[PDB]
């Protein structure tokens, strides 16, 4: 089976699983929308109403697609969706991991200029160590996240559900630490009593902060907002490994085919980016076929690998 897409299934599975892509007409919400061209990249499926199509349901004027992902591991409802982790790829290029140097699959590909590749196991270790050391990055717009392990700029992970790789309890700690950092970012304080955990925005012009809040919100400890003691009177990556672990830049030793003959009429068709759904433009042919599998286009290829990176 070729799987292009991964979700986190928080339901029966509690792990990163291959995902099934589905599409519907955004007007009638039925799986009756014929796309002009299939999705060729993540933005095509993540940005709602981006893609044009013609709805096949009687008299529906719908022309916009909405895509959803379900976990591929089990019979699901259409409405039992899972979150797509769009940085995760099948390692079709056999690119080595930036940290362990092994070829593994799946991998996560950072959005740095270098598109650095880390296996998911190393990604787990990266997240756990950074979390425990309080070296996650708090960003006022993006929230609590991490960049590329190599330290590349503009590479903070935007889809925070990737941190579900931590596992449920570590993810809860992730969100907790993110909340504390947000509080501090906002000019708040954390209660210093061991085991309390409260954070709050205190009143402006007072050095005395009390951990306020009935029904368990606070513990009533009064501390100095300066020194955080009880309120008191008076003064208080390997360079080569990183090079090799680049999704695009380290893949050029292998020829990338961009054109394949239509299986039916044998006339060459150009691939559109990462889209696997090929449409013969010959008017007497019009075969639709999967680039990857070679077979007539069908819903299995659609769900499993409509496009790839």
């Amino acid at each position: 089976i070729y799987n292009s897409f991964y979700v986190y299934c928080k339901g029966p599975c509690q792990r990163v699983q291959p995902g099934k892509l589905r599409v519907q007409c955004s007007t009638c919400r039925q799986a009756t929308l014929t796309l002009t061209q299939g999705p060729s990249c993540w933005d095509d499926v993540l940005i709602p109403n981006r893609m044009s199509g013609e709805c096949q349901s009687p008299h529906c004027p719908g022309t916009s697609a909405e895509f959803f992902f379900n976990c591929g591991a089990h019979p699901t409802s259409d409405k039992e969706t899972s979150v797509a982790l769009h940085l995760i790829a099948t390692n079709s290029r056999n690119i080595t991991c930036i940290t362990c140097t092994d070829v593994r699959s799946p991998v996560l590909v950072f959005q740095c200029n270098s598109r650095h590749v880390i296996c998911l196991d190393c990604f787990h270790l990266y997240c756990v160590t950074r979390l425990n050391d309080r070296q996650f990055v708090h960003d006022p717009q993006l929230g609590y996240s991490l960049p590329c392990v190599a330290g590349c700029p503009n590479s903070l992970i935007k889809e925070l559900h990737h941190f579900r790789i931590l596992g449920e309890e570590q993810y809860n700690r992730y969100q907790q630490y993110g909340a504390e950092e947000c509080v501090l970012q906002m000019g708040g304080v954390l209660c210093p009593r061991p085991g309390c955990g409260a954070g709050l925005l205190p009143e402006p012009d007072q050095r005395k902060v009390t951990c306020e809040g009935g029904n368990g919100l606070g513990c009533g400890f009064a501390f100095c907002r300066e020194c955080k003691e009880a309120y008191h009177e008076g003064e208080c990556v390997d360079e080569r490994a990183a090079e090799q672990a680049r999704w695009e830049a380290a893949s050029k030793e292998t020829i990338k085919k961009t054109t394949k003959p239509c299986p039916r009429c044998h006339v060459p068709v150009e691939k559109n980016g990462g889209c696997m759904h090929m449409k013969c433009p010959q008017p007497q042919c019009r075969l639709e076929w999967c680039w990857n599998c070679g077979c007539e286009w069908n819903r299995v290829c659609m769900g499993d690998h409509w496009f790839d990176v």
């Binding site: 993006l142 509080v183 906002m186």
Partner: protein, 74 residues
């Protein structure tokens, strides 16, 4: 509706049922209903992001059963 948890930093989870189109403002009203904290005094934070009153849970990509943290502004 969708079940979310509103979690105090001290670790108490408050279960709230929301419509996915409910504004964050409306979420705070639901918290007031259950906990008696005036919305004005609530800050809701999801994965480190301060949630704006005019956005919906769907704007923050929050899934069913997920946790928003609640912080008091005195």
């Amino acid at each position: 509706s969708m079940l979310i948890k509103v979690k105090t930093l001290t670790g108490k989870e408050i279960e709230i049922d929301i419509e996915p189109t409910d504004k964050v403002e409306r979420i705070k009203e639901r918290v007031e209903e259950k906990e008696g904290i005036p919305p004005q005094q609530q800050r809701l934070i999801y994965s480190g992001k301060q949630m704006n009153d005019e956005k919906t849970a769907a704007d923050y990509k929050i899934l069913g059963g997920s946790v928003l943290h609640l912080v008091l502004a005195l």
